[PDB]
Design an enzyme around this catalytic site. Structure first.
Site, short mmCIF file in Angstrom:
data_model
loop_
_atom_site.label_atom_id
_atom_site.label_comp_id
_atom_site.label_asym_id
_atom_site.label_seq_id
_atom_site.Cartn_x
_atom_site.Cartn_y
_atom_site.Cartn_z
N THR F 1 5.49 -8.46 -11.44
CA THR F 1 5.39 -7.14 -12.27
C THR F 1 6.78 -7.20 -13.78
OG1 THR F 1 4.97 -6.18 -9.90
CG2 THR F 1 5.00 -4.65 -12.04
N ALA F 49 2.74 -2.00 -4.72
CA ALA F 49 1.26 -1.97 -4.69
C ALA F 49 0.60 -0.52 -4.27
CB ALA F 49 0.39 -2.60 -4.76
C1 LIG Z 1 4.73 -6.41 -8.97
C2 LIG Z 1 6.35 -5.30 -8.57
S1 LIG Z 1 7.71 -6.41 -8.46
C3 LIG Z 1 8.22 -6.86 -7.07
O1 LIG Z 1 8.64 -5.54 -8.68
O2 LIG Z 1 7.79 -7.81 -9.24
C4 LIG Z 1 3.80 -5.38 -8.53
C5 LIG Z 1 3.37 -4.03 -9.46
C6 LIG Z 1 2.15 -3.83 -9.02
C7 LIG Z 1 1.56 -2.37 -9.21
C8 LIG Z 1 0.56 -1.43 -8.63
C9 LIG Z 1 -0.79 -2.40 -8.34
C10 LIG Z 1 -1.43 -2.42 -7.88
N1 LIG Z 1 -3.07 -2.67 -6.76
C11 LIG Z 1 -0.69 -3.33 -7.72
C12 LIG Z 1 1.27 -4.21 -7.68
N2 LIG Z 1 3.79 -5.35 -7.12
C13 LIG Z 1 3.85 -6.53 -6.64
O3 LIG Z 1 3.33 -7.86 -6.30
C14 LIG Z 1 4.00 -5.47 -4.81
C15 LIG Z 1 4.96 -6.86 -4.88
O4 LIG Z 1 6.12 -6.31 -3.17
C16 LIG Z 1 6.87 -5.13 -3.31
N3 LIG Z 1 3.21 -6.49 -3.61
C17 LIG Z 1 2.98 -5.84 -2.54
O5 LIG Z 1 2.98 -4.69 -2.50
C18 LIG Z 1 1.91 -6.35 -1.81
C19 LIG Z 1 0.23 -5.82 -2.47
C20 LIG Z 1 -0.26 -7.15 -1.32
C21 LIG Z 1 -1.89 -6.91 -2.39
C22 LIG Z 1 -0.34 -8.59 -1.74
N4 LIG Z 1 1.93 -6.18 -0.72
C23 LIG Z 1 2.91 -6.38 0.45
O6 LIG Z 1 3.55 -7.12 0.66
C24 LIG Z 1 2.77 -5.48 1.85
C25 LIG Z 1 3.46 -7.28 2.46
N5 LIG Z 1 3.03 -6.03 3.58
C26 LIG Z 1 2.97 -5.09 3.50
C27 LIG Z 1 2.37 -4.07 5.39
S2 LIG Z 1 2.52 -4.65 2.39
#
Ligand SMILES: *[C@@H](CS(C)(=O)=O)[C@H](Cc1ccc(CN)cc1)NC(=O)[C@H](COC)NC(=O)[C@H](CC(C)C)NC(=O)c1cnc(C)s1
Ligand SMILES: *[C@@H](CS(C)(=O)=O)[C@H](Cc1ccc(CN)cc1)NC(=O)[C@H](COC)NC(=O)[C@H](CC(C)C)NC(=O)c1cnc(C)s1
Ligand SMILES: [Mg+2]
Ligand SMILES: [Mg+2]
Ligand SMILES: [Mg+2]
Ligand SMILES: [Mg+2]
EC number: 3.4.25.1
Lengths: 195, 196, 226, 204, 233, 212, 222, 195, 196
Positions: F1, F49
């Protein structure tokens, strides 16, 4: 938030507060004003946990401004500091305490005297000639012990403050990106724009 | 602690040792672990002394109030009230209670309520730390429809062995006999039961 | 893993599945879990696959040298004693669970060995994550004086019970038959009940589909010479 | 914290008709930080090819170790080591560090010079051999590679078809793994010629 | 959150052509102590359902009372309580499944695994599982605890898929269940010889069998087994 | 991100990547990290997310209610503070959010507010948020001036996300560009990194570390 | 300590075509190394031409599907039997999932159907309710095995026009329902080979303007 | 120790290394040279745990100097980096490992080429056009990705390095007190005294 | 595990169940826990199977080497070698061994060696998890100088109860009789002992 200093001279109180806002890896901002005007002759600087600092400061500001309108009267710096102390002392036994340390610099228009109060997050209040929060005092109090006099002018107070900031810039590991300085006297609050 | 209740021809007998320990110190060597919740419904207590006393006091209150409204409660009813308290507060209690009582209709009955708060109706029951050492003995020697003298000997011999092997058990063997005739207290001293 | 061993009229028989796993993924679909020790002594292995392999190979090497030294056919008790003393030494850190079986001048033998160094004697045994599925079958159907034909059936049935009902076990059935006065017969892929079905499509690509930045010839030979 | 996934990277090997293919990505990282886009994970000792994924210091150490051992092998034996023998040497060397292991996922690939038979093998970090007929996978996107290989692969592919299959298996697996990618290399190996191809892939 | 104290082991079951069979031993264990030898763990609800329960016995006795109370409540203002508005296996199960999942979601589970076996109004076999987590599933064979590991493999050899159900008679199904109970007695350290078995048939109704014993046990081979390796005597 | 937003002569540039991860698993390469609150307000998303989607969608509802009640567009300051006061209520519960509220109003001009889940709310000219923020900052700070052409500013924002997409393992997929003016926001397209990278490398002569 | 979560395995797959959508899932239900059931339906018709599956912890999956089905029922009551559009269903599911943000439903959720223009739609959710519309999505145990394959075969990733050097990508096409089902079947056959929690049976629900149709295929039972 | 950078240009290698030595609360020194000359055309900068850094550097220096006397010959930068890597790779499985990350900048007099090697405490070696250790690379690699060309002069390399240091001074929280810069080329090693 | 050794007029008898468990799974239902370290010196093993087998194998080695040099070792000597291993390696062992043997001079002797590595010479000894349930029974029913038939019945009844109550114990009851006459193995199946 890192460094907040305060020094009470003859006819004014001077508050110096660092400009850096760091979130972990990066310095997000280098011009942050860590202070709120509570009333025309009372200024509060603050430092502590992220979010809690500003939330607390603005909450205090709103309450003092509400008092001012209700009574058509400015509370004394002593009264404001006692109000602030009680809010922090209430806070420390809460579900989630405010992690905020403050300095309150004010000019009492009744007594014609500058006043500096140092209050930590526990609600520990002390009136001082000069004060600091966190690691700042470790470097700066020995200087202020040496150079301070109660009859100093505002210009002498600012020179003594430059010597404090130079010592902090020499010996502290963190780059706090300089300080915003504000003077509280009989005429109110003004910012020293060149420091 | 070594406690047991045994049904027999004329009714039921409850039996217990008298030792209460705080670690290896014997806090009370003459404890009365046979406790009255109604005229002819008694119980044997094991586990936390505070908890079993608190429970037994509440049961006694409930059965007293039952009696004022609906007449004499059954032994089954008493065991149910014990169970209700033990089961619903299982997370905060360490209580192992044997309930024993005499009706004229049902005669002698014994209910055991272990840690979980389950109920088990049995011909006889054993419980407490010292009971582990006499499962073998009690199973081999118990018969149904024993006489009063045989049942007293069965309990005396049993708790004698429980006392011998368990450090947590000791002192005097108290017994309470529940029949149509009434309520009889018996006591047996170390010099009697140790030489068995 | 589903490994089993059982005795019959004039012999002993070992069975095993052919699946190796890393957590929930299948690393190997055709692995040999029946390890060789001597010509007429075999070892089924479960637990850590590297450990079961290494410990059987080491004892097999030492058994061969012992056999040369003494000019005798190696005994199953020698393999058993050497395996257990090794495994005991390491206090379960070599996580190998083994069924050892064989024929020697003393007769036919069947043992089990655990990672901590304990051993068992039995007429029928099973180890691994599919042991309970296999043992259920062995407890239902094992009897004294089985014929070879009945023994292979029962052994393969016990392994199959593991294959179908245990996620840890799968693929094919390997068997090894050790009969008195005869060569041991090792029967890899004795059963093949899990062949993959034909695919719906062919995913063979048109040539040039992959984008390439550079090409070069690799010199694998020694000295291109003058 | 998990040594096998600090640096990242992948290796895949496949068999075809009278040929083998081995391929790897080029990334070396410190967790999220990409450091190098030229870190090759495939080495060769004569005609035997060894791919190694996992902790990069061990990848380098083991390469140097097997170069050492195969050089001495060749001086004493007076011939290059074969894939089947080398596989056993890798297993041996890994297992002797059983209780302080190298955090790696090695993959052997090659053609036996005498029999002409294609050969591939894979190992866990302590030396258990997986000798597959079809394909071997290794690295931080091993699950992704298993999925690609299991659907894309068919037996007895010609060298130039096998190239397309292994390349698409690597590329699409790498693009679903944060710690793999940043370039890729594919070796197509025949009995007496070896072609090396660098692939164009997305650089994120 | 608690821990189970007095516990019941495997409940095993399967479908056959005209109905369902369910079985469970009569033991209440207190850890390794085989404390209570007369515990009935199959609890009939009407004449068309049997609920077999394993795990914590105090929580079983609670569930037993809920089902008893359910029958009473169904009869209230219900002229067809013993006819078209009688309790079905599917109603009894869904109630229990609701309770089990609610209780786990308050972090205070009923520490059990439950199998509801029965026959519906239209003659359809009902067999479904639920546990302390509220996890539910149906299958031609179902088993809890050690039964899942040992009984299911044996019972699945009789009914391996849906199409094997019409081909399986009550004699073949009962035989398989009785053999499975023997296997569990050989191999489960917290089991007992005495068990109860219930058949719910769409024609012959509910047959509840008490005080069964595992019989035809093979122990004779034990006499020849000597030492743990090298011992000859 | 990697998300970024910066102020310049011609308004605000907002650029974000498109990757979603669960550990080292690339969950998605086509994620929308910019929320269009109204024609004059944008929200960027970093951190969890779901937390971002849910609460920034909710923010849009609260901003709509403001304009129904007050017959006036919500200020960027007020909108950012609704969100910062909300997350502050949840402080310690474990919400994970890094966000920027970007917009123009007549009274404020173009404004950017950084808001995060530990309750911080900052006004500023330049922000980069996410695992790839440091990489974006490197490129952005070097070539930033107040008076870029809208064309140059759009390129810099795009290029800064590309820089982060390359180096940061958890950033990538594609670049979504926005430009905020007096008249509102304008979408300037989705740019796949697998095509953009090679295009930029050739035209700019950068990325000499890569085998191309 | 009591652990309120478990893992019932399984794998699911949604693919959006031009005028259709499929949602497939294996029928195996497991705990640890034991098979609970070889045929336990995981993909459900929820009414209004929407199909749903919540793969992961089966108790939380069943609870969520049950609640969504009920949400459809009450949407009809409260809004004059109006058809719940797939986009509206998706947003409703976000609120169901996020409602338990601090005690989550341990499931990967996918829904499929047709959008309001009649085009195929798949939506995909994380356990706390973040969602995106996608052309392609696998969820569950073998999602890591299946998704790279779908990137390659559904979205034509890393595939170029032969002879163009590598500068014209393979152009994107909608697949026929027959082609999609071939890719679905091969995905699950492949996933069954290499993942121990996948197997027994494959159930595919196909959604078109005409309604919801089912197809069932055997998978390897080891 | 905090920031160490390296950049290989056309005809030289440039190493920049921070001057601050901080022990917890205070900055004990602001002129520390975090480098050792291993041979006349090979320089090693280092950063990591206190004590271990210098001990390791001087140990390497002594071994390379011993080699030079024994053979009357300078080892190639590649050979020195392989020696250093092996020592670190040996170290990581020791009772107490060296927690030291290094950059080795050298001019190979045989090939007439500058060479920059980045080796971490695990023994992870990579040859690079530009490198960094710790948090430095997070800020500086995106710049170097943008601005670097292989045919840059030494003056262009220094200007690019100023841009890296300015970015670090803007966005890093720690005051690292500037950098000592050293150039390694065909004529040997020299220090840029004004930076 | 339920194990016991009992001295009687003609010598000594060792007795044991046959159950080995890994948790609640019965790994072996026909285990032989009566193990030979010398012709007429045997032992009953309880605790870690690996440890007790490793110890017993070493003792057998030591007594074999003792016999080659100094003739037949006493039962006391065997118990001492067991003790030496158990005591000196107490930090790494979980072994509870009963040693029983027949001399012509000393007749039947029984030595018990619990976890610590202490030695205790006794008329009879009980050990293993199932022994807790029969302390009461065995104390009440043991007599000195019993006949062979009485001692077999005493062991059979005792281990029957141990098996009945302990889940860790079960299977067949194996026994080994040690007298001047020689070494006799006995086995008793569930259908015999359960109905006692
Ligand atoms: C990147 C943020 S980072 C860790 O600083 O690189 C993205 C940003 C983002 C923003 C908005 C959206 C909209 N759908 C998506 C992504 N964030 C993520 O990739 C986060 C990173 O971990 C905190 N991923 C998650 O929130 C994932 C998303 C799934 C679609 C894979 N969910 C989980 O990791 C979960 C695990 N256990 C859960 C209960 S939720
Ligand atoms: C079944 C054992 S079970 C599930 O415990 O009942 C098989 C037995 C087996 C024995 C021998 C061979 C080959 N000669 C193969 C298989 N064992 C396995 O599947 C084991 C895992 O069991 C827990 N697999 C491994 O140990 C794998 C190596 C194979 C994939 C080649 N290694 C690992 O998983 C790891 C080792 N160290 C790690 C860290 S991870
Ligand atoms: Mg990638
Ligand atoms: Mg990246
Ligand atoms: Mg499978
Ligand atoms: Mg028993």
């Amino acid at each position: 938030m890192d460094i907040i200093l305060g020094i009470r001279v003859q006819d004014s109180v001077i508050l110096a507060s660092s400009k850096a806002v760091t979130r972990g890896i990066s310095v997000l901002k280098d011009s942050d004003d860590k202070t709120r005007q509570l009333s025309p002759h009372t200024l509060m600087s603050f430092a502590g946990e992220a979010g809690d600092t500003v939330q607390f400061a603005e909450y205090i500001q709103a309450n003092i401004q509400l008092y001012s309108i209700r009574e058509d009267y400015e509370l004394s710096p002593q009264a404001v500091s006692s109000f602030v102390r009680q809010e922090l002392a209430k806070s420390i036994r809460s579900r989630r305490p405010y992690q905020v340390n403050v300095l309150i610099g004010g000019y009492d228009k009744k007594k014609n005297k500058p006043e500096l109060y140092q209050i930590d997050y526990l609600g520990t209040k002390v009136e001082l000639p000069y004060g600091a929060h966190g690691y700042s005092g470790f470097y700066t109090f020995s200087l202020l012990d040496h150079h301070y006099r109660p009859d100093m002018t505002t210009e002498e107070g600012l020179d003594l403050l430059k010597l404090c900031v130079q010592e902090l810039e020499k010996r502290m590991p963190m780059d706090f990106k300089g300080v915003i300085v504000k003077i509280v006297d009989k005429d109110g609050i003004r910012q020293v724009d060149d420091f | 602690t070594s406690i047991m209740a045994v049904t027999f021809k004329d009714g039921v007998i409850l039996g217990a040792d008298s030792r209460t320990t705080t670690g290896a110190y014997i806090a009370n060597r003459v404890t009365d672990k046979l406790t009255r919740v109604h005229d002819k419904i008694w119980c044997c207590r094991s586990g936390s002394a505070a908890d079993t006393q608190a429970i037994a006091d509440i049961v006694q209150y409930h059965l007293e109030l039952y009696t004022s409204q609906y007449g004499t409660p059954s032994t089954e009813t008493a065991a149910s009230v014990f169970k209700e308290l033990c089961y619903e507060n299982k997370d905060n209690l360490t209580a192992g209670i044997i309930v024993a009582g005499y009706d004229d209709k049902n005669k002698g009955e014994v209910y055991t309520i272990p840690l979980g708060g389950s109920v088990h109706k049995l011909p006889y029951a054993i419980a407490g730390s010292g009971s582990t050492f006499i499962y073998g003995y009690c199973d081999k020697n118990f018969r149904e429809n024993m006489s009063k003298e045989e049942t007293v000997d069965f309990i005396k011999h049993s708790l004698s062995q429980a006392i011998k092997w368990d450090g947590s058990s000791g002192g005097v063997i108290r017994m309470v006999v529940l029949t149509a005739a009434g309520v009889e207290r018996l006591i047996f001293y170390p010099d009697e039961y140790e030489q068995l | 893993t589903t490994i089993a061993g059982l005795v019959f009229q004039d012999g002993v028989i070992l069975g095993a599945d052919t699946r190796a796993t890393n957590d929930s993924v299948v690393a190997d679909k055709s692995c040999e879990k029946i390890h060789f020790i001597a010509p007429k002594i075999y070892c089924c292995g479960a637990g850590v696959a590297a450990d079961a392999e290494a410990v059987t190979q080491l004892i097999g090497s030492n058994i061969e040298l012992h056999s040369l030294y003494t000019s005798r056919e190696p005994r199953v008790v020698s393999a058993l004693q050497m395996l257990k003393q090794h495994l005991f030494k390491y206090q379960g850190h070599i996580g190998a669970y083994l069924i050892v079986a064989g024929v020697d001048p003393t007769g036919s033998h069947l043992f089990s060995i655990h990672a901590h160094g304990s051993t068992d004697v039995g007429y029928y045994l099973s180890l691994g994550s599919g042991s309970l599925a296999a043992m259920a079958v062995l407890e239902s159907h094992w009897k004294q004086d089985l014929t070879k034909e009945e023994a292979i059936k029962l052994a393969s049935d016990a392994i199959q019970a593991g294959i179908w009902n245990d996620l840890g076990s799968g693929s094919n059935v390997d068997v090894c038959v050790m009969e008195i006065g005869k060569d041991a017969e090792y029967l890899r892929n004795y059963l093949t009940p899990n062949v993959r079905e034909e695919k719906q499509k062919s995913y063979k690509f048109p040539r040039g589909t992959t984008a390439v930045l550079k090409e070069s010839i690799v010199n694998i030979c020694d000295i291109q010479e003058e | 914290s998990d040594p096998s996934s600090i640096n990242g990277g992948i290796v895949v090997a496949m068999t075809g008709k009278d040929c083998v293919a081995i391929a790897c990505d080029l990334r070396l990282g410190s967790q999220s930080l990409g450091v190098s886009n030229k870190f090759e994970k495939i080495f060769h000792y004569g005609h035997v090819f060894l791919g190694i994924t996992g902790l990069a210091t061990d990848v380098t150490t083991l390469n140097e170790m097997f170069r050492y051992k195969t050089n001495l092998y060749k001086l004493k034996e007076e011939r290059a080591i074969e894939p089947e023998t080398f596989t056993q040497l890798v297993s041996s060397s890994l297992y002797e560090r059983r209780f302080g292991p190298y955090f790696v996922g090695p993959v052997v690939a090659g053609i036996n010079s005498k029999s002409g038979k294609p050969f591939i093998a894979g190992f866990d970090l302590i030396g258990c051999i997986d000798e597959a007929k079809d394909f071997i996978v290794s690295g931080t996107a091993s699950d992704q590679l298993f999925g690609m290989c299991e659907s894309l692969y068919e037996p007895n592919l010609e060298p130039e078809d096998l190239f397309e299959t292994i390349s698409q298996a690597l590329l699409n697996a790498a693009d679903r793994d944060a710690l793999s990618g940043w370039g890729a290399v594919v070796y197509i190996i025949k009995k007496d010629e070896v072609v090396k191809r660098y692939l164009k892939m997305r650089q994120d | 959150t608690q821990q189970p104290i007095v516990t019941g082991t495997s409940v095993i079951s399967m479908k056959y052509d005209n109905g369902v069979i369910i079985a469970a031993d009569n033991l209440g264990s207190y850890g390794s102590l085989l404390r209570f030898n007369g515990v009935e763990r199959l609890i009939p609800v009407g004449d068309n359902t049997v609920v077999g329960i394993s795990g914590d016995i105090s929580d079983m006795q609670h569930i037993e009372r809920l089902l008893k109370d359910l029958v009473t409540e169904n009869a209230y203002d219900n002229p067809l309580a013993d006819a078209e508005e009688a309790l079905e296996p599917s109603y009894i199960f869904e109630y229990l499944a609701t309770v089990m999942y609610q209780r786990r979601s308050k972090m205070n589970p009923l520490w059990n695994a439950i199998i509801v076996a029965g026959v519906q109004s239209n003659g359809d076999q009902f067999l479904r599982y639920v546990n302390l987590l509220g996890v539910t599933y149906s299958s031609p064979t179902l088993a809890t605890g050690f039964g899942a590991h040992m009984a299911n493999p044996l019972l699945r050899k009789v009914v391996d898929r849906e199409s094997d159900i019409p081909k399986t008679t009550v004699q073949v199904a009962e035989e398989a269940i009785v053999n499975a109970m023997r296997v569990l007695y050989y191999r489960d350290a917290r089991s007992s010889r005495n068990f109860s078995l219930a058949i719910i048939d769409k024609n012959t109704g509910l047959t509840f069998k008490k005080n069964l014993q595992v019989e035809n046990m093979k122990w004779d081979f034990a006499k020849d087994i000597k030492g743990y390796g090298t011992q000859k005597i | 991100t990697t998300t970024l937003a910066f102020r310049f002569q011609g308004g605000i540039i907002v650029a974000v990547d498109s990757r979603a991860t669960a550990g080292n698993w690339v969950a998605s390469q086509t994620v929308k990290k910019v929320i269009e609150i109204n024609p004059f307000l944008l929200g960027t998303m970093a951190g969890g997310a779901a937390d971002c989607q849910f609460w920034e969608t909710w923010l849009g509802s609260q901003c709509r209610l403001h304009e129904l009640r007050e017959k006036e567009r919500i200020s960027v300051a007020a909108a950012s503070k609704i969100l910062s006061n909300l997350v502050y209520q949840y402080k310690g519960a474990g919400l994970s959010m890094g966000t920027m509220i970007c917009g123009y109003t007549r009274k404020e001009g173009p404004t950017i507010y950084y808001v995060d889940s530990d309750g911080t709310r900052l006004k500023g000219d330049i922000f980069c948020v996410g695992s790839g923020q440091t990489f974006a900052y490197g490129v952005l700070d070097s070539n930033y001036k107040w008076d870029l052409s809208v064309e140059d500013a759009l390129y810099l924002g795009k290029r800064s996300i590309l820089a982060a997409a390359h180096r940061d393992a958890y950033s990538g997929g594609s670049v979504n560009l926005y430009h905020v003016t007096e008249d509102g926001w304008i979408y300037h397209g989705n740019h796949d990194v697998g095509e953009l990278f090679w295009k930029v490398k050739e035209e700019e002569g950068s990325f000499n570390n890569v085998i191309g | 300590q009591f652990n309120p979560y478990g893992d019932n395995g399984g794998t699911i797959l949604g693919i959006a075509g031009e005028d259709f959508a499929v949602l497939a899932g294996d029928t195996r239900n497991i705990t640890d190394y034991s098979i609970n059931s070889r045929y336990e339906p995981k993909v459900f018709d929820c009414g209004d031409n929407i199909v749903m599956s919540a793969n992961g912890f089966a108790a939380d999956g069943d609870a969520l599907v049950k609640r969504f089905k009920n949400s459809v029922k009450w949407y009809h009551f409260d809004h004059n039997d109006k058809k719940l559009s797939i986009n509206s269903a998706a947003r409703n599911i976000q609120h169901l999932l996020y409602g338990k943000r601090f005690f989550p439903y341990y499931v990967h959720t996918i829904i499929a159907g047709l959008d309001e223009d009649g085009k195929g739609a798949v939506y995909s959710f994380d356990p706390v309710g973040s969602y995106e519309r996608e052309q392609c999505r696998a969820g569950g145990a073998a999602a890591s095995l299946i998704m790279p394959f779908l990137d390659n075969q559904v979205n034509f990733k890393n595939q170029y026009e032969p002879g163009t050097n590598g500068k014209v990508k393979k152009p994107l096409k909608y697949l026929s329902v027959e082609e999609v089902i071939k890719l679905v079947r091969d995905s699950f056959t492949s996933a069954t080979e290499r993942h121990i929690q996948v197997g027994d049976g494959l159930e595919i629900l196909i959604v078109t303007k005409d309604g919801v149709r089912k197809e069932f295929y055997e998978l390897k039972r080891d």
